[PDB]
Scaffold this active site. Structure first.
Site, mmCIF file in Angstrom:
data_model
loop_
_atom_site.group_PDB
_atom_site.id
_atom_site.type_symbol
_atom_site.label_atom_id
_atom_site.label_comp_id
_atom_site.label_asym_id
_atom_site.label_seq_id
_atom_site.Cartn_x
_atom_site.Cartn_y
_atom_site.Cartn_z
ATOM 1 N N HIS A 60 111.520 8.048 68.886
ATOM 2 C CA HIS A 60 111.010 7.656 70.225
ATOM 3 C C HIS A 60 111.704 8.435 71.350
ATOM 4 O O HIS A 60 112.942 8.378 71.436
ATOM 5 C CB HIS A 60 111.197 6.154 70.382
ATOM 6 C CG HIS A 60 110.495 5.586 71.563
ATOM 7 N ND1 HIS A 60 109.112 5.646 71.709
ATOM 8 C CD2 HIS A 60 110.981 4.923 72.638
ATOM 9 C CE1 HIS A 60 108.787 5.041 72.830
ATOM 10 N NE2 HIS A 60 109.922 4.592 73.419
ATOM 11 N N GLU B 141 107.744 6.960 64.497
ATOM 12 C CA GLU B 141 107.493 6.098 65.686
ATOM 13 C C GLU B 141 106.432 5.045 65.367
ATOM 14 O O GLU B 141 105.296 5.431 65.009
ATOM 15 C CB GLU B 141 106.981 6.933 66.859
ATOM 16 C CG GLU B 141 108.063 7.667 67.620
ATOM 17 C CD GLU B 141 107.707 7.842 69.087
ATOM 18 O OE1 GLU B 141 107.710 6.817 69.811
ATOM 19 O OE2 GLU B 141 107.412 8.999 69.498
ATOM 20 N N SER C 173 107.494 6.249 77.092
ATOM 21 C CA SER C 173 107.294 4.870 76.597
ATOM 22 C C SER C 173 106.430 4.086 77.613
ATOM 23 O O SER C 173 105.308 4.551 77.922
ATOM 24 C CB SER C 173 108.638 4.256 76.288
ATOM 25 O OG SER C 173 108.513 3.217 75.307
#
Lengths: 297, 297
Positions: free
Chosen positions: A269, A239, A145
């Site tokens: 994710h 996502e 991320s």
């Protein structure tokens, strides 16, 4: 698999809803993520806290990982949360799968240390690794991320500063667009149980501290990719960040970078985090494992 | 220990629905349980198929596990389903935690092989262990749910037959009473995501073959317990079978049996099966490890 995938999806769906309930309160938000964290690998994993050129860090070594092969790992959490503690289990498994010792960075977070505190720690940390006489050709800079974004940022900074670049960059579900202009922010909104445009832009604003949303080192979508080392990008289809990976992959190839992009069907994710019971999570970690070896040989 | 317990509870609630939607379709039911099972420990576990006195079985040894110290493990699944495949992971964790080699039985299941075939396989497997020069003081007979039951029935049958008895017995959420007459069938029915009376009485009837429900070797709550070795009983407070464990613990104590009962707050049926991500899972397994170890010194 799917009762496994469906456990992980309700997993995030609950993480996602306690997130909303914390509101803007950043202590709460940090606790939501820290409460999901376990470390079942702890028993057989060697952990040694260390100062990485002034960045609080931890050596994480799965059994018979080489001292001289190194992952510099940059944890997710929207540049406002996450810690060595939240990502420790994933890092241990990446260490195992790659036969490499991880340096896991506790990099400074927003709102306390807004952009570019994170980038300066990553670079500081990398320069420290070179100072310890680890070859650049034996390092890979990896992250998830926000930390996937920070991998790109970091490599860009290092290339600007003319420091020997590492053997490769691994991005898991990287966050590279602070404004959320990706097509997937609409076409994957239903499918994604946790990352949504609103909450992510808000987290971005907090990271930027009112600086420009298109700043290359904060939003590496907009960065210059020429001369970066090989990039491995894993992303799930379910996502809203799908198009941060698709756009980065396209733009980097055009810039002459060797990119490998995997779009994992139905995965959410940083599905890697569910590795202990979700087979795709451990599969995805084994692929990264192999990449790091085929890059550091 | 709650975002994780909530994932486990959802796990059971999804499983419980897939159970209900097969109806009484036993092929389909057997598939629901296989769906949910993974074997993430597979890579470090040595698995060896074997015929155990005319019972299809598997040696499962974690690293460290000794040859001359054995768990005869008897899997759950209401005497109609489950397999070595469903319980492989839990069994390998019991192997590591106890430093003992385990023998997992594919005991014969109803309605193809109704009561008493499971008990004859169990005892046949036990006597085979003894034929292979494994000392009874180095044996523990362990089981969950229906298999918890089967541990009791097996030790009863062995005592009655004057076969030298094992060091201990271990029952995880054991099923002792075929009629579900315990207070917990009412007091824990809301709390328990998976075991309800109707579905379970009806599953007993399948095992019984219209034989008597008070039949001691089918419903070991009604067995004589005098002579049996030490028992370790672990059960969740969030279980309809809670009082099978409390009643069996009270009878056994009264009949001179050295009994150690643990009631685990909030935990559901065979929560061990979620050890990979559920910390109380791995804790419960760690205790059985320590029990087997102390009972076989």
């Amino acid at each position: 698999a799917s009762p496994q995938l469906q456990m992980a999806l309700d997993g995030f769906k609950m993480m996602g809803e306690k997130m909303a309930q914390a509101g803007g309160d950043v202590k709460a938000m940090r606790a939501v993520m820290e409460e999901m964290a376990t470390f079942p690998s702890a028993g057989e994993t060697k952990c040694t806290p260390v100062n990485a050129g002034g960045v609080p860090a931890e050596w994480i070594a799965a059994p018979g990982a080489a001292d001289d092969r190194v992952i510099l790992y940059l944890h997710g959490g929207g540049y406002v949360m996450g810690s060595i503690t939240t990502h420790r289990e994933t890092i241990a498994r990446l260490s195992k799968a790659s036969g490499a010792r991880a340096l896991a960075l506790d990099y400074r977070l927003a709102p306390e240390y807004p952009f570019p505190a994170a980038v300066d720690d990553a670079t500081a940390a990398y320069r420290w690794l070179l100072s310890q006489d680890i070859k650049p050709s034996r390092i890979v800079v990896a992250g998830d991320s926000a930390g996937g974004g920070l991998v790109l940022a970091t490599l860009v900074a290092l290339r600007d500063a003319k420091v020997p670049l590492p053997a490769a960059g691994v991005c898991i579900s990287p966050w590279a667009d602070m404004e959320g202009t990706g097509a997937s922010m609409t076409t994957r909104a239903k499918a994604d149980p946790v990352v949504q445009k609103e909450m992510l832009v808000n987290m971005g604003k907090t990271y930027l501290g009112g600086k420009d949303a298109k700043s290359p080192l904060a939003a590496p979508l907009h960065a210059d990719f020429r001369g970066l080392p090989p990039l491995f990008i894993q992303v799930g289809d379910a996502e809203t960040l799908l198009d941060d990976s698709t756009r980065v992959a396209e733009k980097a190839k055009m810039a002459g970078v060797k990119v490998d992009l995997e779009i994992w069907p139905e995965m959410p994710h940083v599905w890697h985090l569910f590795a202990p019971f979700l087979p795709e999570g451990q599969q995805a970690i084994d692929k990264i494992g192999q990449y790091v070896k085929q890059r550091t040989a």
